[PDB]
Amino acid sequence: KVFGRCELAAAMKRHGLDNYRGYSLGNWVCAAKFESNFNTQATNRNTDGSTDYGILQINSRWWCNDGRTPGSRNLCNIPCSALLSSDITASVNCAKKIVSXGNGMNAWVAWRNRCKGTDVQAWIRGCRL
């Protein structure tokens, strides 16, 4: 499913991601935009043999099991396929484990390089939240 900007914002807010660990809703929407382009079905292979899955591009080396990643940890105890559902619940709950202390949202390369330190408030502009 390809979410709309406000559509995803409302869903993330409903799941308690707004200000989660101090990260405003705009940070999470911005991360989703640049990681998956708001597409829950996005998958991207990595040089280390791992693969990123879903709207928040969660990695198969540490967080979910995809059955083909050497040294997989599956810290979120879910198959990576669960992160591709139109329902973002699994992605949100895993993202909450990832951002909790560690290095927080620095775990997301797109967030660090395109959201961190930027005007993230703009990502929820016009949204009825």
Ligand SMILES: CC(=O)N[C@@H]1[C@@H](O)[C@H](O[C@@H]2O[C@H](CO)[C@@H](O[C@@H]3O[C@H](CO)[C@@H](O)[C@H](O)[C@H]3NC(C)=O)[C@H](O)[C@H]2NC(C)=O)[C@@H](CO)O[C@H]1O
């Ligand atoms: C969104 C996403 O999946 N991003 C992936 C990153 O999470 C991943 O980074 C590595 O993550 C692991 C697990 O959190 C890091 O290990 C943790 O490191 C902290 C210190 O910062 C330590 O306190 C934790 O105990 C330790 N956890 C465990 C279980 O050992 C690890 O340092 C990260 N590695 C790097 C280079 O950042 C990266 C790389 O696998 O992939 C992203 O896709």
